[PDB]
Amino acid sequence: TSIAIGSAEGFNQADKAINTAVKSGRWVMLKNVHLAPGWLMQLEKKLHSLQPHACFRLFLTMEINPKVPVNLLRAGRIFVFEPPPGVKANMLRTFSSIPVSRICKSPNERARLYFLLAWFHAIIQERLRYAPLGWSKKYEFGESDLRSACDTVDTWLDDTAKGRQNISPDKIPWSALKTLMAQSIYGGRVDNE
Amino acid sequence: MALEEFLKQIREVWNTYELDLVNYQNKCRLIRGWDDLFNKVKEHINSVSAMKLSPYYKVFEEDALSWEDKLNRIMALFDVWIDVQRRWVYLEGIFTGSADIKHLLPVETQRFQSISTEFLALMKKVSKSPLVMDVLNIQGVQRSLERLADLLGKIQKALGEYLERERSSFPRFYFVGDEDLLEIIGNSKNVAKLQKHFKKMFAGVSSIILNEDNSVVLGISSREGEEVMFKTPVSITEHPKINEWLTLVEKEMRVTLAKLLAESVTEVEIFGKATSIDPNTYITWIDKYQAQLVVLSAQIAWSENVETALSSMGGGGDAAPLHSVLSNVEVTLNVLADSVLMEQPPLRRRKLEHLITELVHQRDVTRSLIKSKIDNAKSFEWLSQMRFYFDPKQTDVLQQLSIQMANAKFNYGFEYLGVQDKLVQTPLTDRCYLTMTQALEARLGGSPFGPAGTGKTESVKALGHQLGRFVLVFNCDETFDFQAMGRIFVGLCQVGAWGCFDEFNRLEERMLSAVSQQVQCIQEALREHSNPNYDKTSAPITCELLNKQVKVSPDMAIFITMNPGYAGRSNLPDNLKKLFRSLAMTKPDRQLIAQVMLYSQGFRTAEVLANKIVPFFKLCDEQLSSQSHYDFGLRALKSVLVSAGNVKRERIQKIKREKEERGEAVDEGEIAENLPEQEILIQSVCETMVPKLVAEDIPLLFSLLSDVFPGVQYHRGEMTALREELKKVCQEMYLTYGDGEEVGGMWVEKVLQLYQITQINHGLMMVGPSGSGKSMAWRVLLKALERLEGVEGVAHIIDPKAISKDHLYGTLDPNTREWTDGLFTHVLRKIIDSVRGELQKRQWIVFDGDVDPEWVENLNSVLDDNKLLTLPNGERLSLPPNVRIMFEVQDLKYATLATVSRCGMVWFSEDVLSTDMIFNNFLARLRSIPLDESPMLQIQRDAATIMQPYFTSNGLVTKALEHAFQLEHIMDLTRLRCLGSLFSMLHQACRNVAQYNANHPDFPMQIEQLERYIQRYLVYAILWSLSGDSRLKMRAELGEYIRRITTVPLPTAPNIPIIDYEVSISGEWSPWQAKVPQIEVETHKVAAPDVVVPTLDTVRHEALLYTWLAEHKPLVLCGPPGSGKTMTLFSALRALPDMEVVGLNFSSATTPELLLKTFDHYCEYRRTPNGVVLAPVQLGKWLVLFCDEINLPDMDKYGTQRVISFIRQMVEHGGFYRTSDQTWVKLERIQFVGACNPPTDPGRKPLSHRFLRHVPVVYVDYPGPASLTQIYGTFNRAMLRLIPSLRTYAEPLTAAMVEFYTMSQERFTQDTQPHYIYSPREMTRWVRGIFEALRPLETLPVEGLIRIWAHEALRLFQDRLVEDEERRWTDENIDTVALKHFPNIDREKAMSRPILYSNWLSKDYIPVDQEELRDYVKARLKVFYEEELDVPLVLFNEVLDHVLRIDRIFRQPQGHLLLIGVSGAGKTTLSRFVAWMNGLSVYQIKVHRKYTGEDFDEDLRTVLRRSGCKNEKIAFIMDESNVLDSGFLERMNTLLANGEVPGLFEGDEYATLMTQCKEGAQKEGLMLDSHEELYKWFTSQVIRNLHVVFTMNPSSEGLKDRAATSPALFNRCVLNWFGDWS
Amino acid sequence: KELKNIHVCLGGLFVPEAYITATRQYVAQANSWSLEELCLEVNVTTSQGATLDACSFGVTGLKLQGATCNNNKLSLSNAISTALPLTQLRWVKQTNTEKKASVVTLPVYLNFTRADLIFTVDFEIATKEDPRSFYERGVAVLCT
Ligand SMILES: Nc1ncnc2c1ncn2[C@@H]1O[C@H](COP(=O)(O)OP(=O)(O)OP(=O)(O)O)[C@@H](O)[C@H]1O
Ligand SMILES: Nc1ncnc2c1ncn2[C@@H]1O[C@H](COP(=O)(O)OP(=O)(O)O)[C@@H](O)[C@H]1O
Ligand SMILES: Nc1ncnc2c1ncn2[C@@H]1O[C@H](COP(=O)(O)OP(=O)(O)O)[C@@H](O)[C@H]1O
Ligand SMILES: [Mg+2]
Ligand SMILES: [Mg+2]
């Protein structure tokens, strides 16, 4: 059960979800909990005096906001999500996130296209570490763009290779992939000529 | 003669005019002819107004009053009858038409049945006597209607649950307000009244078409008059239910449009694939079909032609049939261009422009295909384009047309969009279409972002209109909470409509995160709708919205347009940004927009003009000075282009007309060829861009125009007919008028420029410094246009910052979800309804106040092309074409570019209104308007003649005003503040002469004496109006400058400044020192609160304040705390017996509610025919509101004070707005007086220049050592008369007091500690302290007097000290001062190391020994342990000192304590111990976790009742930890100062209080009766019985913060720094 | 007349974009050309040997990032910044002779933050350097 924190009745859903989960043993995720630091104090107190089910897991999503309660950080386990250190790490997370079945589909040329997408994503996202030179500003080139680009590759490759086991590299729609990424997927956030 | 004729016409009209009654569904006879009845009453009232003006009104005075009283009752009664009749009609239809409401709302039906039967009974009574006079005189009919309206109001609100049930039946009802929905449901039988509600339910359907019986829906219509005829008309008889036949209309609308498109496609295929096209045939096809179908048919034909051509080029060597497609497009484009060049009907002209705009795009795309050598239909250069495919073999007409872009497939919704302004298909828009369609295919949302004016809202709407979808625009803000957005999503999901949430990021960050849950689940439902496994036979797809299953239509989409870094915006959460595909719309292709727009308008040189106008706008942005009201973006370019089309159209008509008078010749080709297209574009630029330019930027723009358009000159058309109208209006308003370079010439051009902006823009801004002639500009133009065009002009002036945003726009109840209209919403909704013919008048809504994005961005959709006001409850209000939203501001520093780009600015520089223009207006008013309400007028006319030479350019006043600006003042100087004070003071000179004439009936004032008095007073008036807010030496400095430049005789004193001289009524300068006598105060009134020793500064300021107060003019006294601002004002008010003063103490948390509570307590609201009037309860006395901390209230982040803006509105406009019912309340007999420290003091904010203009400021400085010696030498001499032996020491005692105070003031300043404020108040407390000690003493040796003198110095100058070295310095210097001024005395007997005085060990206040005092305190503490508190204490030397200090304060009237020290030091225990010793009852608030403001109010009332009514002394002990809210301090701030809280006792509490004050007065022996003196006695008792002890920790920043949140804590409380134990 | 012959640092100007317009407006007025028809061409001069010719406007203080200008030809360099001695802004009529396939448009930013763009220059590549390499390496010109 996923609940976005921030509404008056959002807290009511969060309390009901946690009360039901600690007995059933399901998972509860509360997103943007940094927007209600005062309610986080009460959540920490409730969690401490609790004996939940073995399989119960509570996930809290925050923004690394200095207003997050200290006692909540001490009680929970902190996982920090950030750009990978380099190109090699960027490729590894890109390949790990994509299911193995998605890459291994009917055209054998899909794997190379995904690798090129993985490399292109790694290069432009690493250039963000050099703000004036790599780009003109800190663009939000993130996982959402990679998901859209991967969906674009899957849709267009299926359209051309209609069930063929192998496709000629010349028949791959390079113009479609290049234009869509430059205009819609990745070029949407770009505002500088 | 004619007077009798007017009376006869009124009588014969009213005894013969019968109310118009018609049958209404064979139930009753309703009243019609409302406009005829209302205007007849108004025109007769105006005749009664002219009845009074004529001199012969004397004999006819009695008859006119009887008629006017009759008319007002007729006007008031029928104003309510029209309301109750309308409410009854739609309420009756709801309860009668639907039989299911009998069970859901049984009690509500029963109440309405009784109301309806009573209403129908009144219909029978009025039907018997249709005459207006007979129905008016019905017994209690007026009261019977007020209850009827209230009863209809109560039943109206209770139907909210029924309305929400009905919205589910027809989902489009969700975008209709509750009141409008009631009208639609109730009036289902009378469809004729539904024609004004279709525009809120459909994209372009403004009304339906009905047959003669009004029982069959023949078709629909648009706003422009375009009509669509249903193939199978919908019959209402077989589907009586309103939602049933409305649904059939919507379903028939789509099918009819689909069928019409198929026929249109068949016809347009002939024009396609044709080398030659007949213009006559093409025009006929355009006229036959609808605007959206003509463009759609052209798009389909071109798409099929290119698809056929590309398929034919499969081989690659097919001789490129794409050239044939390009040839046909150009040939058809040639025909369209020719058709526009000639005169066409307005509807066909719009169709041609739409066809040109699209065919230009089709030509551009085909050229790209030709250039790129595309020979395959699967090439992405063709796939990326938007292609329309038509399938005539498709059985379902709704699925015949398929729109595709890249890999996205769409279906035309066939929503009737009417005729919309189609956009130019720029490459950026193509990029927008590609990205948004890709987002739609992935079932995501679209989030275009960028700067303002780039075209994101229009592009989203254009794409929706391209697919035939219902696009709804919502102007998002912070009140779009989870419930409001969920209800909107429910409506969009069920309807199947696009939602464009513009300014989405303006929501709160927490609310944006919450909304992300609803968008996520909606998109998940959409995503699983696109699965091919889905079957329509199964249950329709649903999403969990607002804890309810909501069906999701596939056509629904969500779009959010936002500005990333603009002020007033929030940051979207990351989980929400992943639900939208963002696109950067930053640089619009304005070059192509200009070319296509001018090409479609008929310009021959569109390419040349576009290549000249777009760079001109870029150069203007890069060259002109950076001003806050400058916008050279696409909106400015769009406004120029549309004006160019309008200028050309009217120029062509004028040329065509001109040929008619000359003769007979009409040739479109010759007119088009001989047309100055260069001049037309420059005219539009000058009519739109010149008004906003500052003085130094105008030559830069004209130089740019000359360079870009060389050899082309513009001469503005002389609006002659308007200029006489302005000249006549200006003369009646005493306003100077000028032509060109004449005096007032610049102002008139601004008025004409503002007139042109009104004609072009529906949203205006008047940006310019305070007092630059802005209000007079639009006031004169509104009146001039009323005379010129004959259309009545009504202006609704609103101050947006004087009220909260909830009261300005409306609020949505979190619990009941009921929408309450705000100020602006009520005004706009009233005009839209036009119940009383508001739509037939020129309505202007003027926002007279500051502009910041918090409130002004809610008008983003109103000022945009939408012309729509969107509310959080889903209701939208279209701005009527006759309504102009106008802003009158002084700057645009805090306004974002989103609003600056939306309005046409008119810049009013301060040089527009020259000084002599104000001088002429003053003298014109003086010569015409009598001051009393003629001998008084004759004095004014004679005085004006004397002041004429001085009130000229380069005259005495103008030269003096110029010099006064060089000198610095306590407040920022403005021209109109000096002139406004000067004019009000010269009026008093005229009143002084009139008083002299009444005092000397036999010998009136002569001309020669009048010249002497007025000339001398004018010099006196200039000095005190220009340097009144400046220090003493610059009051002098302006004196010599006047002496150097004036010819008026001046005092011949070698060194005495002119500011020390007054003007006697005899016409001679006389010193102010002659009115300062060496008075002898009585002994019992020594240092009394109301005793004022007259000094030079006091008499000068008292006369100045009396002059301003006698004119009922607002004023502010500025000066250091304790300088004597309050004392001087109250002393001046004692000379005015008809003025009562009410004290208000402002703080950093002061809001207009504090003023409103005072108005409720001291004034009353009364209904008058002219409107609501707020006047004091007591008759004939003027109420004066004394605001003591006027500049303390906090400025928000946008630099405005809400209370100051409230006062500025309520001073300039003479009234405010009552937010209870959104009615204008006009003040009567209410005056405002302010006091404040200089703005350079910490915590003080400078007052707004638009407020200081109306308010003169006088600077009250600290008395000098000479003044202090005179003031307190008088007190010491009178006080020392108690002991005749000590009378010789009065002079040295005063010198010692002044000397020590001077050094203590210099040594300890606010820089060291915030509370180190030393004022003459300490000297007054010094005199009082010595007086009370000596009073009892029968005799005292000089040593005893010095010991008392030193003790008072220690208790006043050392108690507040913090550091030990400061206390050591005070101890040492007191010894030196006493020895310096009192030699040869026993220093040891006087300046002993411990100085303690107490009345505990004797009847008198004599010095006490430390050892003997300790034994007494030890003995009393032992008793204190068993009785009250058994906490052991330890007595050291500091405790004995501290208990004596607390005892001294507890014995004083209004004696409050401020104990500062570390916790655990005994501050509370010592306070309780001393209070028990002095008999006080200790009260502490038992604060807990759930303690709130209401609990504190109850505790405050409990203490006040005990200490005010029961005469019980109470030591209210309060700690800083008990302050859980700023509300606690605000109540304490007022209670400490005034001894009362105005809004504390209300309703039953006030009634219970008044009984208790009455009984308590009986015990005291006074039988007070009225509530006024009961409260005055109650306030006096609380003052003398309530002591408040405030304890807080010695914080650094907290003490400074408390110095502003609660100023009374440092001015009314005696501060003692306990600190830590040394 | 001297106001045309003074070398001005665009970094030291309060608004440098207004200076570019002023030079554009001066050339159009003197030669009786239209403002929109003018185009800007760049000529980096070694020291100040070259002289203004009624259309040139010397500009100093321009810094070239990641490239070196020799004989008005660019070559990629490993230095962080390269100072241009004297940049001559010549306003000429547009000839629409298309690109030379060795001309790259360098942005001219006001400062190192690369937040605001003043104008764009069309320099020429020397030798066999790839124009795409200039784009990838973020080569630009800074006013200060
Ligand atoms: N054309 C005119 N001729 C003569 N006097 C004028 C004229 N226009 C304005 N005034 C006077 O000059 C003063 C300017 O007041 P006005 O209301 O026009 O200023 P404003 O720009 O609206 O000021 P604010 O910003 O304070 O609202 C007033 O005293 C007004 O009577
Ligand atoms: N001419 C005077 N005669 C008598 N008392 C004076 C005179 N001038 C100043 N004072 C003393 O100065 C004090 C002024 O305090 P007040 O006017 O209340 O300060 P504020 O104007 O800042 O509220 C009074 O208590 C008064 O005793
Ligand atoms: N002079 C004193 N001798 C002994 N104990 C004291 C003395 N003054 C305060 N206390 C102690 O402080 C406690 C009360 O503190 P309190 O006066 O409430 O602190 P505060 O002055 O900060 O409100 C008592 O329990 C008492 O024991
Ligand atoms: Mg917008
Ligand atoms: Mg005004």
DSSP string spanning B447-515?
EEE-STTSSHHHHHHHHHHHTT--EEEEE--TT--HHHHHHHHHHHHHHT-EEEEETGGGS-HHHHHHH
Which is the closest atom of ligand 3 to the Cα of B1461?
A: 22
The tokens describing B1403, both together, are 């009847």
CA atoms within 13 A of residue B378's CA, in its CB half-sphere: 8
Which residues are B448's β-sheet partners? B583
The tokens describing B94, both together, are 């709801």
CA-CA distance, B224 to B414, in Å (whole number)? 19
The tokens describing B1436, both together, are 């050291």
Residue pair C62/C111 in contact (Cβ under 8 Å)? The answer is no
- Token match 């005003």: residue? B961
Q: Where are the alpha helices (DSSP H) in B130-218?
A: 132-136, 141-157, 160-169, 178-186
Residue pair B1238/B1257 in contact (Cβ under 8 Å)? The answer is no
Interface of B with A in 472-531 (CB under 8 A): 481-482, 508-514, 516-517
Maximum Cα interatomic distance, chain A, rounded to a whole number of Å: 64
Residue A104's CB: how many other CB atoms inside 10 A?
11
CA-CA distance, B721 to B723, in Å (whole number)? 6
| List of residues 6+ apart from B1094 with CB closer than 8 A | B1075, B1076, B1077, B1079
The tokens describing B1549, both together, are 């509490």
Task: Report resolution in angstroms.
Answer: 2.9
Cα of B568 to ligand 4 centre, how many Å?
A: 15
CA-CA distance, B20 to B31, in Å (whole number)? 5
Is residue B903 classed exposed, middle or buried when 0-12, 13-18 and 19+ CB atoms within 10 A define those classes?
buried
| List of residues 6+ apart from A33 with CB closer than 8 A | A5, A40, A43, A60, A61, A62, A68
Residue pair B1139/B1180 in contact (Cβ under 8 Å)? The answer is no
Residue pair B224/B419 in contact (Cβ under 8 Å)? The answer is yes
3-state secondary structure of B1422: helix
**Helices and strands in chain C, H and E counts:** 2, 11
What torsion, rounded to 10 degrees, do the Cα atoms B29, B35, B36, B39 define?
140
Q: Which helix or strand (DSSP H or E) is residue B794 part of?
A: strand B793-798
Cα–Cα distances (Å) from C19 to A77, B704, B1541, C16, C22, in that order, read: 58, 14, 63, 5, 5
Chain C residues with CB inside 8 Å of B710's CB? Answer: 32, 34
3-state secondary structure of B402: strand
Rounded to a whole number, what is the distance in Å from the CA of C113 to chain B's nearest CA?
Answer: 17
CA-CA distance, B1285 to B1278, in Å (whole number)? 13
CA-CA distance, B639 to B616, in Å (whole number)? 15
Cα–Cα distances (Å) from B1341 to B172, B1237, B1285, B1336, in that order, read: 96, 42, 8, 14
CA-CA distance, B1378 to B1000, in Å (whole number)? 57
Chain B interface, mutation test: which of A34, A183, A186, most B Cβ atoms within 10 Å?
Answer: A183
The phi and psi torsions of B1388 (rounded to 5 degrees) equal -65, -40
Binding-site positions of B read 450-457, 768-775, 1119-1126, 1461-1468
Q: At what angle do helices B346-372 and B590-601 cross, to 10 degrees?
A: 130
Residue pair B294/B354 in contact (Cβ under 8 Å)? The answer is yes
CA-CA distance, B872 to B177, in Å (whole number)? 11
Query: Is C20 in the B-facing interface, judged by CB distances under 8 Å?
Result: yes
What does the buried/exposed string (b/e) look like for B320-350 if buried means 16 or more CB atoms within 10 Å of the residue's CB?
bbbebbbebbeebbebbbebbbeebeebebb
- Token match 């640092």: residue? C9
CA angle B712, B715, B721 (to 5 degrees): 155
Residue pair B982/B1025 in contact (Cβ under 8 Å)? The answer is yes
CA-CA distance, B343 to B763, in Å (whole number)? 30
Residue pair B556/B491 in contact (Cβ under 8 Å)? The answer is no
The tokens describing B346, both together, are 């307005």
Q: Of B627, B521, B520, which Cα lies nearest the Cα of B579?
A: B520
Counted residue by residue, chain B has a size of 1622
Residue pair B1310/B1317 in contact (Cβ under 8 Å)? The answer is yes
The tokens describing B248, both together, are 């059939």
CA-CA distance, C112 to C132, in Å (whole number)? 22
Cα–Cα distances (Å) from B239 to B165, B220, B247, B253, in that order, read: 19, 18, 10, 17
Chain A residues with CB inside 8 Å of B517's CB? Answer: 2-4, 10
The tokens describing B714, both together, are 């513009």
3-state secondary structure of B873: coil
Q: Which helix or strand (DSSP H or E) is residue B884 part of?
A: strand B883-889
Compute chain B's Rg from CA coordinates: 40
Strands (E), chain A: 2-4, 27-31, 57-60
- Token match 């009854």: residue? B88
3-state secondary structure of B395: coil
CA-CA distance, B403 to B1144, in Å (whole number)? 69
CA-CA distance, B1439 to B1471, in Å (whole number)? 11
3-state secondary structure of B848: strand
CA-CA distance, B1015 to B1017, in Å (whole number)? 6
Residue B235 DSSP class: E
The tokens describing B296, both together, are 């759609």
Interface of C with B in 28-57 (CB under 8 A): 28-29, 32, 34-36
Residue C105 DSSP class: E
| List of residues 6+ apart from B97 with CB closer than 8 A | B185, B186, B188, B189
Maximum Cα interatomic distance, chain B, rounded to a whole number of Å: 132
Put simply, the answer to whether B710 touches C36 (Cβ < 8 Å) is no
CA angle B952, B953, B954 (to 5 degrees): 110
CA-CA distance, B715 to B1450, in Å (whole number)? 81
Q: Of B925, B842, B931, which Cα lies nearest the Cα of B884?
A: B842
Maximum Cα interatomic distance, chain C, rounded to a whole number of Å: 45
Which residues are B1217's β-sheet partners? B1224
Residue pair B412/B401 in contact (Cβ under 8 Å)? The answer is yes
Strands (E), A57-189: 57-60
Q: Which residue from C minimizes the CA distance to B622?
A: C18
CA-CA distance, B284 to B271, in Å (whole number)? 12
Answer positive or negative: Cα dihedral of B1489, B1494, B1495, B1499: positive
Count of CB pairs separated by less than 8 Å, A with C: 9
CA-CA distance, B1259 to B1118, in Å (whole number)? 5
Residue pair B1063/B1013 in contact (Cβ under 8 Å)? The answer is yes
- Token match 């009364």: residue? B1166
The tokens describing B811, both together, are 């609020």
The phi and psi torsions of B475 (rounded to 5 degrees) equal -90, 95
Q: Which residue from A minimizes the CA distance to C111?
A: A132
Q: Of B799, B1256, B1222, which Cα lies nearest the Cα of B985?
A: B1256
Counting ligands in written order, the one closest to the CA of B459 is 4
Q: Which residue from B minimizes the CA distance to A34?
A: B510
Rounded to a whole number, what is the distance in Å from the CA of A108 to chain B's nearest CA?
Answer: 22
Answer positive or negative: Cα dihedral of B1028, B1030, B1035, B1039: negative
Interface of A with B in 102-161 (CB under 8 A): 140, 143-144, 148, 151, 155-156, 159
Residue pair B413/B421 in contact (Cβ under 8 Å)? The answer is no
The response to whether residue B1098 sits with its C-beta less than 6 Å from ligand 2 reads yes
* Residue B1265 identity (one-letter amino acid): P
CA-CA distance, B488 to B873, in Å (whole number)? 8
Chain C residues with CB inside 8 Å of A136's CB? Answer: 114
3-state secondary structure of B1050: coil
Beta strands B471-475 and B498-502: pairing type? parallel
Q: Of B1435, B1427, B1127, which Cα lies nearest the Cα of B1260?
A: B1127
Residue pair B618/C38 in contact (Cβ under 8 Å)? The answer is no
Is residue B1058 classed exposed, middle or buried when 0-12, 13-18 and 19+ CB atoms within 10 A define those classes?
buried
* Residue B967 identity (one-letter amino acid): L
Residue pair B1185/B1232 in contact (Cβ under 8 Å)? The answer is yes
Is residue B898 classed exposed, middle or buried when 0-12, 13-18 and 19+ CB atoms within 10 A define those classes?
buried
Q: At what angle do helices B634-662 and B745-760 cross, to 10 degrees?
A: 100
Residue pair A102/A154 in contact (Cβ under 8 Å)? The answer is yes
Which is the closest atom of ligand 3 to the Cα of B1591?
A: 23
CA atoms within 13 A of residue B565's CA, in its CB half-sphere: 2
3-state secondary structure of B855: helix
3-state secondary structure of B54: coil
CA angle B104, B106, B110 (to 5 degrees): 150
Which residues are C87's β-sheet partners? C44, C59
Put simply, the answer to whether A10 touches B450 (Cβ < 8 Å) is no
Q: Of B595, B588, B602, B680, which Cα lies nearest the Cα of B635?
A: B588
CA angle B692, B912, B791 (to 5 degrees): 75
How far does CA B1023 lie from the centroid of its chain? 36
CA-CA distance, A159 to A152, in Å (whole number)? 11
Q: Which residue from A minimizes the CA distance to B582?
A: A188
Chain B residues with CB inside 8 Å of C15's CB? Answer: 626
Put simply, the answer to whether B710 touches C17 (Cβ < 8 Å) is no
The tokens describing B1483, both together, are 């009260």
CA-CA distance, B1244 to B1600, in Å (whole number)? 12
- Token match 């910044």: residue? C81
Query: Is B434 in the A-facing interface, judged by CB distances under 8 Å?
Result: yes
Is residue B999 classed exposed, middle or buried when 0-12, 13-18 and 19+ CB atoms within 10 A define those classes?
exposed
3-state secondary structure of B1441: helix
Beta strands C86-93 and C38-45: pairing type? antiparallel
Query: Nearest C-alpha to atom 27 of ligand 2 is from which residue?
Result: B1324
CA-CA distance, B217 to B245, in Å (whole number)? 9
Beta strands C117-125 and C103-109: pairing type? antiparallel
Residue B1435's CB: how many other CB atoms inside 10 A?
14
CA-CA distance, B1559 to B1553, in Å (whole number)? 10
Q: Which helix or strand (DSSP H or E) is residue B327 part of?
A: helix B322-341
Cα–Cα distances (Å) from B1385 to B1055, B1345, B1348, B1374, in that order, read: 42, 11, 14, 15
Rounded to a whole number, what is the distance in Å from the CA of A4 to chain B's nearest CA?
Answer: 5
Put simply, the answer to whether B512 touches A6 (Cβ < 8 Å) is yes
Rounded to a whole number, what is the distance in Å from the CA of A104 to chain B's nearest CA?
Answer: 22
Binding-site positions of B for ATP read 450-457, 768-775, 1119-1126, 1461-1468
CA angle B305, B308, B313 (to 5 degrees): 125
CA angle B413, B416, B418 (to 5 degrees): 140
How far does CA B475 lie from the centroid of its chain? 19
Answer positive or negative: Cα dihedral of B643, B647, B648, B653: positive
**HEC per residue, B1501-1527:** HHHHHHHHCCCCCEEEEEEHHHCCCHH
Strands (E), chain C: 8-9, 38-45, 58-60, 63-65, 67-70, 73-76, 82-83, 86-93, 103-109, 117-125, 140-142
Residue pair B823/B1217 in contact (Cβ under 8 Å)? The answer is yes
DSSP states of B1570-1605 = SHHHHHHHHHHHHHHHEEEEEEE---SHHHHHHHHH
Residues on chain B bordering chain C, Cβ-to-Cβ distance under 8 angstroms: 611-612, 615-616, 619, 622-623, 626, 703-704, 707-708, 710
Beta strands B1456-1460 and B1586-1592: pairing type? parallel
Residue pair C143/C11 in contact (Cβ under 8 Å)? The answer is yes
The tokens describing B233, both together, are 């008309």
